[PDB]
Design a protein around this motif. Structure first.
Motif, PDB file in Angstrom:
ATOM      1  N   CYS A  15       3.735  11.870  -0.662  1.00  0.00           N
ATOM      2  CA  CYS A  15       4.029  11.459   0.708  1.00  0.00           C
ATOM      3  C   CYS A  15       4.280  10.038   0.735  1.00  0.00           C
ATOM      4  O   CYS A  15       5.126   9.482   0.991  1.00  0.00           O
ATOM      5  N   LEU A  16       3.134   9.567  -0.104  1.00  0.00           N
ATOM      6  CA  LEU A  16       3.527   7.847  -0.210  1.00  0.00           C
ATOM      7  C   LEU A  16       4.561   7.671  -1.005  1.00  0.00           C
ATOM      8  O   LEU A  16       5.243   6.517  -0.776  1.00  0.00           O
ATOM      9  N   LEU A  17       4.860   8.397  -2.115  1.00  0.00           N
ATOM     10  CA  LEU A  17       6.158   7.948  -2.842  1.00  0.00           C
ATOM     11  C   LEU A  17       7.324   8.276  -2.442  1.00  0.00           C
ATOM     12  O   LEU A  17       8.338   7.502  -2.418  1.00  0.00           O
ATOM     13  N   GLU A  18       7.648   9.280  -1.571  1.00  0.00           N
ATOM     14  CA  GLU A  18       8.760   9.752  -0.684  1.00  0.00           C
ATOM     15  C   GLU A  18       8.935   8.331   0.330  1.00  0.00           C
ATOM     16  O   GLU A  18      10.022   8.094   0.531  1.00  0.00           O
ATOM     17  N   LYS A  19       7.876   8.368   1.240  1.00  0.00           N
ATOM     18  CA  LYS A  19       8.087   7.362   2.316  1.00  0.00           C
ATOM     19  C   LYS A  19       8.257   5.998   1.720  1.00  0.00           C
ATOM     20  O   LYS A  19       8.932   5.133   2.345  1.00  0.00           O
ATOM     21  N   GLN A  20       7.900   5.559   0.623  1.00  0.00           N
ATOM     22  CA  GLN A  20       8.137   4.365  -0.131  1.00  0.00           C
ATOM     23  C   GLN A  20       9.730   4.162  -0.161  1.00  0.00           C
ATOM     24  O   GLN A  20      10.382   2.992   0.004  1.00  0.00           O
ATOM     25  N   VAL A  21      10.500   5.393  -0.374  1.00  0.00           N
ATOM     26  CA  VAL A  21      11.840   5.375  -0.596  1.00  0.00           C
ATOM     27  C   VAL A  21      12.530   5.594   0.511  1.00  0.00           C
ATOM     28  O   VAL A  21      13.513   4.708   1.078  1.00  0.00           O
ATOM     29  N   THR A  22      12.214   6.705   1.417  1.00  0.00           N
ATOM     30  CA  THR A  22      13.073   7.269   2.407  1.00  0.00           C
ATOM     31  C   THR A  22      12.877   6.313   3.798  1.00  0.00           C
ATOM     32  O   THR A  22      13.838   5.941   4.328  1.00  0.00           O
ATOM     33  N   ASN A  76      -2.970  -5.657  14.419  1.00  0.00           N
ATOM     34  CA  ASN A  76      -3.934  -4.681  14.783  1.00  0.00           C
ATOM     35  C   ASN A  76      -4.916  -4.035  13.825  1.00  0.00           C
ATOM     36  O   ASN A  76      -5.693  -3.115  14.140  1.00  0.00           O
ATOM     37  N   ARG A  77      -5.116  -4.989  12.761  1.00  0.00           N
ATOM     38  CA  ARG A  77      -6.148  -4.491  11.770  1.00  0.00           C
ATOM     39  C   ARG A  77      -6.233  -3.055  11.096  1.00  0.00           C
ATOM     40  O   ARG A  77      -6.832  -2.560  10.272  1.00  0.00           O
ATOM     41  N   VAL A  78      -4.989  -2.324  11.549  1.00  0.00           N
ATOM     42  CA  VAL A  78      -4.641  -0.886  11.004  1.00  0.00           C
ATOM     43  C   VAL A  78      -4.614  -0.754   9.743  1.00  0.00           C
ATOM     44  O   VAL A  78      -3.681  -1.392   9.001  1.00  0.00           O
ATOM     45  N   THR A  79      -5.467  -0.160   8.811  1.00  0.00           N
ATOM     46  CA  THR A  79      -5.331  -0.473   7.212  1.00  0.00           C
ATOM     47  C   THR A  79      -4.252   0.358   6.748  1.00  0.00           C
ATOM     48  O   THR A  79      -4.013   1.792   7.177  1.00  0.00           O
ATOM     49  N   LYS A  80      -3.401   0.091   5.889  1.00  0.00           N
ATOM     50  CA  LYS A  80      -2.336   0.846   5.533  1.00  0.00           C
ATOM     51  C   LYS A  80      -2.751   1.078   3.963  1.00  0.00           C
ATOM     52  O   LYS A  80      -3.529   0.603   3.382  1.00  0.00           O
ATOM     53  N   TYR A  81      -1.866   1.903   3.323  1.00  0.00           N
ATOM     54  CA  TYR A  81      -1.924   2.296   2.098  1.00  0.00           C
ATOM     55  C   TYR A  81      -0.748   2.153   1.212  1.00  0.00           C
ATOM     56  O   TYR A  81       0.485   2.706   1.735  1.00  0.00           O
ATOM     57  N   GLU A  82      -0.610   1.737   0.185  1.00  0.00           N
ATOM     58  CA  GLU A  82       0.449   1.334  -0.966  1.00  0.00           C
ATOM     59  C   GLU A  82       0.086   2.473  -1.984  1.00  0.00           C
ATOM     60  O   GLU A  82      -1.052   2.912  -2.353  1.00  0.00           O
ATOM     61  N   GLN A  83       0.930   2.501  -2.959  1.00  0.00           N
ATOM     62  CA  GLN A  83       1.113   3.346  -4.121  1.00  0.00           C
ATOM     63  C   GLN A  83       0.892   2.543  -5.371  1.00  0.00           C
ATOM     64  O   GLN A  83       1.428   1.510  -5.403  1.00  0.00           O
ATOM     65  N   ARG A  84      -0.189   2.577  -6.015  1.00  0.00           N
ATOM     66  CA  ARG A  84      -0.291   2.197  -7.467  1.00  0.00           C
ATOM     67  C   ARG A  84      -0.102   3.231  -8.290  1.00  0.00           C
ATOM     68  O   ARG A  84      -0.273   2.984  -9.569  1.00  0.00           O
ATOM     69  N   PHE A  85       0.473   4.227  -7.879  1.00  0.00           N
ATOM     70  CA  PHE A  85       0.922   5.353  -8.800  1.00  0.00           C
ATOM     71  C   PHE A  85       1.839   4.896  -9.910  1.00  0.00           C
ATOM     72  O   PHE A  85       1.641   4.918 -11.134  1.00  0.00           O
ATOM     73  N   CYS A  86       2.849   4.637  -9.547  1.00  0.00           N
ATOM     74  CA  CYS A  86       4.016   4.128 -10.534  1.00  0.00           C
ATOM     75  C   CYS A  86       4.473   2.763 -10.180  1.00  0.00           C
ATOM     76  O   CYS A  86       4.647   2.310  -8.899  1.00  0.00           O
ATOM     77  N   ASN A  87       5.039   1.986 -10.872  1.00  0.00           N
ATOM     78  CA  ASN A  87       5.861   0.894 -10.961  1.00  0.00           C
ATOM     79  C   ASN A  87       5.075  -0.050 -10.296  1.00  0.00           C
ATOM     80  O   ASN A  87       5.664  -0.522  -9.212  1.00  0.00           O
ATOM     81  N   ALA A  97      13.992   5.233 -10.749  1.00  0.00           N
ATOM     82  CA  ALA A  97      14.580   5.928  -9.421  1.00  0.00           C
ATOM     83  C   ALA A  97      14.610   7.359  -9.527  1.00  0.00           C
ATOM     84  O   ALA A  97      14.196   8.113  -8.679  1.00  0.00           O
ATOM     85  N   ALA A  98      15.438   7.708 -10.550  1.00  0.00           N
ATOM     86  CA  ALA A  98      15.550   9.071 -10.740  1.00  0.00           C
ATOM     87  C   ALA A  98      14.571  10.110 -11.144  1.00  0.00           C
ATOM     88  O   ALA A  98      14.376  10.979 -10.648  1.00  0.00           O
ATOM     89  N   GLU A  99      13.515   9.225 -11.922  1.00  0.00           N
ATOM     90  CA  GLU A  99      12.479  10.046 -12.244  1.00  0.00           C
ATOM     91  C   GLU A  99      11.728   9.906 -11.081  1.00  0.00           C
ATOM     92  O   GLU A  99      10.658  10.937 -10.809  1.00  0.00           O
ATOM     93  N   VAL A 100      11.659   9.027 -10.161  1.00  0.00           N
ATOM     94  CA  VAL A 100      10.580   8.860  -9.042  1.00  0.00           C
ATOM     95  C   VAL A 100      10.879  10.229  -8.132  1.00  0.00           C
ATOM     96  O   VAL A 100      10.178  10.675  -7.398  1.00  0.00           O
TER      97      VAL A 100
END
Ligand SMILES: [Cl-]
Length: 171
Positions: A15-22, A76-87, A97-100
């Motif tokens: 989900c975090l990989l998809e939303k980072q792009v879409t 608003n202090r709402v903690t967000k999350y980023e992807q350390r999975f790739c790149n 991008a094609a492999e992501v």
């Protein structure tokens, strides 16, 4: 890699990989955004209904395993999350991008054919042909970086074979 993802962990990562792009305007994702993306009726196989507490537990797990990272500051202090999975700046996992797009689609919808992935991964990366998807899957299974996709035994009467990611083990 080091940590093998469970079924629900692979969905949170996907989900975090998809939303980072879409949806870059909503990235990084809050806890509610990750939960909503996990339980979407579309682009999800299987369709899940994970609670907010379960998602937070998976978020806590992937953070300490250095697949995700907490972002807070103020606003608003709402903690967000980023992807350390790739790149990232840090890690050694580099995915084009094609492999992501290919990795994310299999992470969210399971074993799929190149024809399937040509349609369902265009949202994150438009492949000019199916030679691109074919070349993308072949690459991720050949890297000394590691086998990231496996191609399953072809179905009887299927006409095309299916591929599956290897972040959750062997099939
Ligand atoms: Cl729960």
């Amino acid at each position: 890699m080091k940590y093998q993802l469970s079924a629900t962990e692979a969905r949170v990562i996907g989900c975090l990989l998809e939303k980072q792009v879409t949806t870059p305007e909503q990235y990084p994702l809050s806890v509610n955004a990750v939960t909503m993306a996990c339980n979407q009726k579309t682009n999800r196989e299987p369709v899940m209904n994970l609670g907010e507490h379960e998602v937070q537990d998976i978020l806590d797990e992937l953070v300490k395993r250095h697949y995700l990272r907490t972002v807070s500051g103020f606003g608003n202090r709402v903690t967000k999350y980023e992807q350390r999975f790739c790149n990232s700046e840090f890690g050694d996992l580099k995915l084009s991008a094609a492999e992501v797009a290919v990795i994310t689609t299999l992470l969210l919808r399971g074993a799929q054919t190149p024809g399937e992935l040509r349609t369902r991964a265009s949202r994150m990366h438009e492949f000019a042909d199916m030679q691109e998807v074919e070349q993308t899957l072949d690459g991720l299974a050949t890297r000394e970086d590691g086998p990231y996709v496996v191609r399953l035994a072809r179905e009887p009467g299927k006409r095309e074979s299916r591929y599956m990611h290897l972040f959750s083990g062997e099939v």
